[PDB]
């Protein structure tokens, strides 16, 4: 049992760090497209 | 000689128990894991909904 308890441990830290790299990354896009989304206003009669 | 046949059967049988707790102390604590499981769990159902 602690050997499945420290290896489940060990996968959520896994799965922390996954979200954490999905997060940034995400964050970046999120970015990114409000950039875009900036750009966009700045090229827009009406 | 029964009482020591039987003495030294519970003296092997104490030492198989410390041979195995000895193992079982080279691991972290149970409860402990369990908290920062639970810390864990919610930790990351909060990243996964932001996510």
């Known amino acids: ?3 499945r308890l420290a290896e489940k ?3 959520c830290l ?3 760090e996954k979200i954490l790299k999905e997060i ?3 964050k970046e896009y999120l970015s990114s497209l409000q950039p875009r989304l900036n750009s966009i206003m700045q090229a ?3 | ?3 020591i046949l039987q003495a030294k059967r519970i003296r092997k049988n104490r030492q198989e128990y410390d041979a195995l707790a000895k193992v079982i102390q080279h691991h972290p604590d149970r409860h402990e894991t369990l908290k ?3 810390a864990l769990g919610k930790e990351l159902e909060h990243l996964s909904h932001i996510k």
């Open chain 1, 1 to 3: 049992q602690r050997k």
């Open chain 1, 9 to 11: 441990y060990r996968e």
């Open chain 1, 14 to 16: 896994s799965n922390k």
């Open chain 1, 24 to 26: 940034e990354v995400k």
């Open chain 1, 44 to 46: 827009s009669v009406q």
């Open chain 2, 1 to 3: 000689k029964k009482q």
């Open chain 2, 36 to 38: 920062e499981l639970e």
